[PDB]
Swiss-Prot record, chains A, B:
Binds 1 zinc ion per subunit. The lineage of its organism: Eukaryota, Metazoa, Chordata, Craniata, Vertebrata. The gene is NQO2. Its main location: cytoplasm. Homodimer. Inhibited by melatonin, resveratrol and 5-hydroxytryptamine. It is found in: Cytoplasm. The enzyme apparently serves as a quinone reductase in connection with conjugation reactions of hydroquinones involved in detoxification pathways as well as in biosynthetic processes such as the vitamin K-dependent gamma-carboxylation of glutamate residues in prothrombin synthesis. This is Ribosyldihydronicotinamide dehydrogenase [quinone]. Its EC number is 1.10.5.1. Substrate binds at F126, D127, I128.
Length: 230, 230
């Protein structure tokens, strides 16, 4: 049996370092004989806003709209917006979910944040109780491929931007692990725009190279200690 | 003389605890005689996507689209989308910027993330010469008024969600401090949905009451130590 992979891609320019790191993952994983699917959010013009338009049935409480309550109900009633369910299908079948994106304000670009806000709804990605170790999407793997504007030094404990693991907390722990995902070590391609053509090629190569043995990797200890190191 | 406050509001329902917190802020601040403006993102159906549409006119390089470069150029060129500039006019005139939003995946809702991604562009919010303590928007105050689903205990250093100061890093340090803002201690109305009518009123009341002396408040030492250290 093989593996299914979903690459949530968030970048406007196809000729970008992000586009390349995505094409690379597709080429490599496909070469391995893996089933690959890519969600080019910008190309799809994915709706980032969480509104009442995400529910197609009668609202539970039309007087006071509570997005969480409504989407949770909609998911169970199979009345969620189509674009939401489409992504949920790809995630449900995936064994590995890779997020390819440029660092936007120490987090993910708005279009990607919307993906996470609307797709990973209650009932699908988690329950109460049913998060973190017992998240509904448990068993699946997750990996963040982030390119940055700042350099590696900038992202050290004593660096101006602080340790890179600090901003990974919301994404890796608060989102991914919360949904049950097993987080693999993030892939951070530091300051490509500053790097030389050769250094860039090295970063792209390093990605492909790592992917060759991606299925043999063990997930990181998604704990507060891993991110902050007390 | 006088004070200007911009409240970037991010919530779908006017009858929500978030709507109430925003309304109260408008009340107290207006009572104080302050100049108050509110950006109801959802009502405005604000565009969270950072696309080429954000630039009006000829792109500096239409062959390869680089958002940060295109926008920075468009800012200096006065070729940015009106919806972005409008928000920039408000921010530039404000003395205090309050963000009212529910916690979405240890961060801000996608619509709000978009506001931060598109409005706080290079040339306006920051620039190679100035960031963090030398950020372009230096001198201005900033405050995050966030409501959470999880209780306070869940947000302790030894809790499931970890210390609240952890998820605040990317927002307070990575975004606000990066632009030069003076970050005031955040206001976190923990699990309002779970709280009793009595407890909630206490949360709302604490919000307005705090607003009475906001101008006498000292900006928190936005350091890594503050967020993670002891
Ligand atoms: C809204 C916003 C917020 C931001 N927030 C942050 C932040 O919080 N922290 C931070 O550090 N940075 C930040 N930045 C910067 C952002 O992280 C970088 O712009 C981004 O990571 C760069 O990646 P890119 O794909 O856009 O690269 P590109 O601009 O495409 O640069 C890559 C270069 O490599 C070339 N190239 C493409 N493919 C290949 C290939 N296969 N081999 C060799 N060369 C190739 C490209 O053509 C180009 O010359 C922000 C920028 C914006 C617009
Ligand atoms: C995509 C998504 C991601 C999420 N991620 C997180 C996360 O990372 N962490 C986390 O902890 N939670 C998370 N949540 C939950 C979210 O943080 C909470 O649902 C939200 O903060 C609750 O705030 P609210 O304004 O919607 O409250 P409401 O649902 O409006 O509840 C307030 C209650 O008080 C009533 N009320 C209204 N006005 C007043 C008033 N003036 N005085 C008294 N009572 C009043 C309301 O009608 C209601 O009964 C997430 C939810 C979603 C949809
Ligand atoms: C927040 C931020 C930090 C960077 O180091 C950086 C470097 C180069 C371009 C943009 C950015 C940016 O927006
Ligand atoms: C991450 C997260 C944590 C909560 O405590 C919570 C509570 C109620 C609804 C949703 C959430 C949520 O998404
Ligand atoms: Zn974790
Ligand atoms: Zn800071």
């Amino acid at each position: 049996a093989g593996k299914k992979v979903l690459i949530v891609y968030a970048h406007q320019e196809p000729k970008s370092f992000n586009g390349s790191l995505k094409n690379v993952a597709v080429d490599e994983l496909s070469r391995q004989g893996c089933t690959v699917t890519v969600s080019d959010l910008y190309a799809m013009n994915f709706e980032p806003r969480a509104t009442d338009k995400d529910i197609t049935g009668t609202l539970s409480n039309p007087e006071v709209f509570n997005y969480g309550v409504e989407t949770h109900e909609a998911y169970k009633q199979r009345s969620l917006a189509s674009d939401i369910t489409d992504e949920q299908k790809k995630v449900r079948e995936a064994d590995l979910v890779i997020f390819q994106f440029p660092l936007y304000w120490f987090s993910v670009p708005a279009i990607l944040k919307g993906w996470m806000d609307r797709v990973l709804c209650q009932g699908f990605a988690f329950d109460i109780p049913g998060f973190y170790d017992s998240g509904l999407l448990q068993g699946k793997l997750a990996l963040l491929s982030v390119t940055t504007g700042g350099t590696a030094e900038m992202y050290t404990k004593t660096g101006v931007n602080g340790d890179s693991r600090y901003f990974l907390w919301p994404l890796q722990h608060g989102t991914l692990h919360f949904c049950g995902f097993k987080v693999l070590a993030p892939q951070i391609s530091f300051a490509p725009e500053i790097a030389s053509e050769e250094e860039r090629k090295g970063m792209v190569a390093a990605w492909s190279q790592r992917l060759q043995t991606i299925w043999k990797e063990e997930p990181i200890p998604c704990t507060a200690h891993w991110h902050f190191g007390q």
